[PDB]
Write a protein that binds this ligand. Structure first.
Ligand SMILES: OC[C@H]1O[C@H](O[C@H]2O[C@H](CO)[C@@H](O)[C@H](O)[C@H]2O)[C@H](O)[C@@H](O)[C@@H]1O
Ligand SMILES: OC[C@H]1O[C@H](O[C@H]2O[C@H](CO)[C@@H](O)[C@H](O)[C@H]2O)[C@H](O)[C@@H](O)[C@@H]1O
Length: 711
């Protein structure tokens, strides 16, 4: 069932007004339908025409924002009674009564139609359904601190001129905002020969001159509006006094352009102030996608393999005891890789010993201090001897503090001359400081690790990585530690001392922790109790009654081929046991007394007892009531798997010739029982139950089918 009427998450529209009902409710005498209101009406229609439930709830969140905006811009509008009513209906259609705390957290985030609320509700519902792991609270925490997601949108929503040939990220709509800032950049010594009245008058010149030198190529002014295709982070790491001093390789013009952008920005966020809404919404939803993958990556990470090699208290001494050349040989031929802290000292040491590394099969050098999403093609240009690498070059001046030599530049140079592959593993997004928040840090680290896993641990590779200490070893994560590049790649992290000692960098215990959290306001746990919701639908027989014929593949595929014949022997033994056939019952509810007798007989036959299993579900009763129905079974253990032995299954609808004792892997047993009973929202616990504990065993209460509000 792709959208069951029995699911609590069906997002039903029964209690949400249609456009025509709204018209009559929001009609005011002498006031024709304005443009805000006509887009509110079109959004409502889309909601009612929406078949895809995820999209529907997305559109509903969008409508809530439009109503928020209308309410803010028209505080005395007489249409506000109807709109406030509609907004409440949308909240109640999306957020069930038991979701109050979730609702409060999600709807406090600004810009309800930005994609954050859509993502958070999707995640919350999957978490409650037991289809995703525990993640919602932490994603809410990430969202609340993020300078893009948690910012009320103040950017550009207008159209983009068609003459622009680059994808636009930021727009300054009215150029005259530059003339409103504190600093007179037109009065600067470097612009006396320009003789310009104001900042906005400098602007066309600043672009034109930088544009020729290679920089700022994705900036265009059309009709008093400035359009930008360079990312905030790209600009920050390629434009500074280190790369843009007076009379330098890239002059002053980019730095002045960026400096006054930041002044116009004020104490708003960059994206909050200048971003296109399209680009804003894309950023919000991609940040959340990526943080989710990062968190998933930390889940159940096993430190045992790494600690087994590098985690002994004295590994530092065993590393130090070796000669420098013995370490290089070990790192290259045994570990297949090593990582250095991103200091110039470490780079210098590496370069001083480069021949030794190459002779032992070094194939690649990787650094996190450059963003592949910006400069990877330009890096390839450098290596191919070509000249189209201006942004790369400017970023190297920044990394090298404006030095002509500089460790990072030397590193790139050696890779070219020695035919070693060079890779950037940094990602530009969310990479600009301050890193005063563990979630921003974790997000940034996670993207670098994902790239490194993808590109670096490949069987025919011997690599060296240069990265920040925070990226190399473990850091605080979401409910658990966030492991470093080095743990993920199965390598050691190293530093070079101030007096040239190449030493191991231990993963300290204080870093291998969860991020410190306060519980969110009134927060309730979302994940289901214990056991499993099979599905939020009505289960049905797909292909008629099950038979021993149909069950055979389920039994044979449950175990390896060399164990197949022993399982069948055990199943034959059970089905042809005299005391087992005595226990057979087709009375309604008989599993209560039968199941324990089965467990006792299995024991006496010399089989290993399993935990058993129980299934419970809702059943439509007379007069719109739903009762709970349940069934339990004993099991045996074989090859680390549990097999139901169900001698009371014939109380349920069955094939005419069917066996009296049902034997299937527990998961196949549950499905069969659910389908034969046409079970609504069935729930399995992997224990057999008896007496009161069977008689009142029911699914999670939020799954009991209910009517939608109302109106
Ligand atoms: O745009 C209006 C306001 O919307 C949000 O506040 C609403 O939603 C909260 C959570 O459900 C409620 O606590 C609150 O009573 C509602 O008004 C948002 O949190 C505010 O910042 C907006 O001003
Ligand atoms: O630039 C200041 C204004 O920012 C917001 O308005 C922008 O964002 C809205 C939602 O995307 C658009 O509808 C609107 O056209 C944009 O200008 C904010 O809503 C306003 O209060 C500010 O004046």
């Amino acid at each position: 069932l792709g959208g069951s009427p029995y699911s609590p998450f069906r997002i039903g529209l029964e209690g949400v007004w249609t456009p025509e009902v709204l018209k009559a409710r929001a009609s005011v005498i002498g006031k024709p339908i304005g443009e805000s209101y006509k887009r509110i009406l079109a959004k409502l229609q889309r909601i009612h025409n929406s078949n895809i439930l995820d999209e529907r709830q997305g559109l509903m969140h969008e409508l809530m924002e439009l109503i928020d905006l209308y309410e803010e811009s028209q505080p005395s509008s007489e249409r506000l009674n109807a709109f406030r009513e509609l907004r409440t209906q949308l909240e109640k259609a999306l957020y069930l009564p038991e979701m109050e705390a979730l609702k409060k957290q999600i709807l406090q985030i600004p810009n309800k139609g930005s994609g954050a609320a859509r993502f958070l509700l999707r995640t919350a519902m999957n978490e409650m359904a037991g289809k995703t792991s525990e993640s919602t609270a932490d994603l809410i925490r990430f969202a609340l601190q993020d300078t893009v997601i948690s910012a009320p949108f103040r950017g550009y929503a207008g159209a983009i001129p068609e003459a622009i040939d680059f994808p636009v990220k930021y727009v300054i709509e009215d150029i005259s905002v530059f003339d409103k800032i504190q600093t007179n950049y037109w009065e600067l010594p470097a612009y006396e020969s320009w003789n310009e009245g104001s900042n906005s008058a400098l602007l066309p010149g600043l672009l034109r001159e930088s544009q020729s030198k290679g920089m700022l190529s994705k900036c265009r002014i059309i009709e008093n509006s400035l359009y930008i295709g360079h990312s905030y982070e790209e600009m920050f790491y390629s434009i500074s006094p280190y790369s843009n001093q007076v009379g330098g390789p890239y002059e002053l013009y980019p730095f002045t352009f960026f400096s006054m952008l930041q002044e116009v920005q004020g104490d708003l966020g960059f994206e909050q102030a200048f971003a296109t809404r399209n680009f804003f919404n894309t950023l919000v939803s991609d940040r959340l996608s990526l943080m989710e993958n990062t968190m998933l990556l930390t889940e159940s990470f096993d430190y045992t393999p790494w600690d087994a090699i590098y985690g002994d208290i004295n590994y530092d001494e065993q590393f130090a005891a070796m000669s420098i050349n013995e370490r290089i040989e070990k790192c290259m031929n045994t570990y297949r890789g090593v990582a250095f802290q991103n200091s110039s000292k470490s780079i210098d040491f590496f370069l001083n010993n480069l021949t030794t590394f190459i002779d032992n099969g070094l194939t690649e050098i990787a650094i996190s201090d450059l963003p592949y999403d910006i400069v990877q093609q330009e890096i390839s240009q450098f290596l191919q001897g070509s000249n189209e690498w201006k942004t790369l070059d400017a970023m190297l001046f920044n990394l090298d503090k404006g030095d002509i030599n500089g460790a990072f530049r030397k590193l790139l140079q050696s890779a070219k001359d020695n035919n070693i592959k060079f890779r950037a593993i940094g990602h530009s997004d969310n990479s600009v400081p301050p890193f005063n928040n563990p979630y921003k840090s974790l997000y940034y680290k996670g993207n670098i690790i994902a790239e490194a896993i993808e590109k670096l641990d490949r069987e025919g590779q011997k690599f060296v990585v240069f990265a920040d200490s925070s990226l190399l070893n473990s850091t605080p994560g979401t409910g658990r530690p966030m492991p470093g590049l080095v743990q993920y790649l199965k390598i050691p992290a190293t530093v070079v001392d101030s007096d040239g000692a190449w030493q191991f960098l231990p993963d300290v215990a204080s870093s291998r922790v969860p991020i410190e959290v306060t519980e969110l306001e009134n927060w309730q746990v979302l994940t289901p109790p214990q056991g499993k919701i099979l599905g939020l639908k009505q289960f049905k027989l797909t292909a008629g009654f099950p038979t021993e014929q149909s069950r055979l593949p389920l039994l044979e595929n449950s175990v390896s081929e060399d164990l197949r014949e022993e399982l069948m022997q055990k199943i034959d033994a059970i089905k042809n046991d005299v005391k087992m056939n005595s226990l057979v019952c087709m009375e309604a509810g008989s599993s209560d007394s039968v199941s324990p007798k089965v467990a006792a007989r299995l024991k006496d036959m010399g089989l290993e007892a399993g935990m058993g299993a129980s299934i419970t579900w809702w059943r439509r009763e007379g007069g719109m009531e739903f009762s709970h129905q349940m069934h339990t079974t004993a099991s045996f253990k074989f090859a680390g798997k549990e097999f139901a032995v169900d001698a009371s299954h014939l109380q349920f609808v069955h094939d005419q010739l069917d066996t009296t004792i049902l034997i299937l892997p527990v998961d196949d047993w549950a499905l069969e029982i659910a389908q034969r009973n046409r079970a609504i929202n069935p729930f399995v616990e992997y224990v057999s139950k008896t007496g009161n504990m069977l008689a009142l065993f029911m699914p999670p209460l939020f799954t009991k089918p209910r009517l939608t509000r109302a109106l």
